Amino acid sequence: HWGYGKHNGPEHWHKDFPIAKGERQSPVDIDTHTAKYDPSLKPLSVSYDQATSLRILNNGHAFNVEFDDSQDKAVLKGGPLDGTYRLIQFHFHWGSLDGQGSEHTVDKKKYAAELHLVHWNTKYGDFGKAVQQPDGLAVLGIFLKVGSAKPGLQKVVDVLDSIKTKGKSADFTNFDPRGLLPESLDYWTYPGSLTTPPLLECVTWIVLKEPISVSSEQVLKLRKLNFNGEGEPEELMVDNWRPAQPLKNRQIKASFK
Numbered sequence: 001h002w003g004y005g006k007h008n009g010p011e012h013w014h015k016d017f018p019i020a021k022g023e024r025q026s027p028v029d030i031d032t033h034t035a036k037y038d039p040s041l042k043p044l045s046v047s048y049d050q051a052t053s054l055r056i057l058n059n060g061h062a063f064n065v066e067f068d069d070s071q072d073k074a075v076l077k078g079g080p081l082d083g084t085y086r087l088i089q090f091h092f093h094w095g096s097l098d099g100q101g102s103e104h105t106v107d108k109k110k111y112a113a114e115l116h117l118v119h120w121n122t123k124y125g126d127f128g129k130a131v132q133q134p135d136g137l138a139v140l141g142i143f144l145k146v147g148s149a150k151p152g153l154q155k156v157v158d159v160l161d162s163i164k165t166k167g168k169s170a171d172f173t174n175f176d177p178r179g180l181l182p183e184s185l186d187y188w189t190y191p192g193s194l195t196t197p198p199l200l201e202c203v204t205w206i207v208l209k210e211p212i213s214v215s216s217e218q219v220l221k222l223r224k225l226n227f228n229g230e231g232e233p234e235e236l237m238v239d240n241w242r243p244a245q246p247l248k249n250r251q252i253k254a255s256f257k
């Protein structure tokens, strides 16, 4: 099956998922000089006050912090979006070294990691139906650089020992994702895809310009996770990122000058 190893990594995905070579694949490099300010974009509305986190799961490719999305409790609206998108989960992509890990790049710069807050359009009723639509998902992408610790991340990294291996989950209630946001909500936006198989072309990407800082100790804990299941040979969960894909016939818009 697909993964991030030498024999099943991103360069292989197209054989099972031909859309890997499609017209609106993600991630992409964000060329900051070519992105155009779009004054008709609205401010982003991130309403996470009533967020209900439930569980954290190691799925063998990352870990997902999952939310109750059966009501409008944590939603993303505004910006490039029409309508209301419900938060279903967040997860990260990260490197084996601080010089790599992010999926999007900025003028070819790779960050140490990248956070994806995944939301689905409520007009499609459930996530499974949403991913079959060109405007089905909105993913808020946030870069991580290594420096000072992020207090709001610590509760996440401290539970990781309990979900070290594929298929393990743990209760993860009362987590506030507002603690993972940078100060500014300035962003770039473009139409793209899921960055893991099935690579569906259903995402409006909103990538924040301001990275968050996390500590070296925090990133070290990410790198202790395992891709493998319990009782299997240890393969560290690192470099679970897809590299930049061709922009093709797309324009990246900026919310700011």
Ligand SMILES: [Zn+2]
Binding pocket: 091, 092, 093, 116, 195
């Ligand atoms: Zn992701």
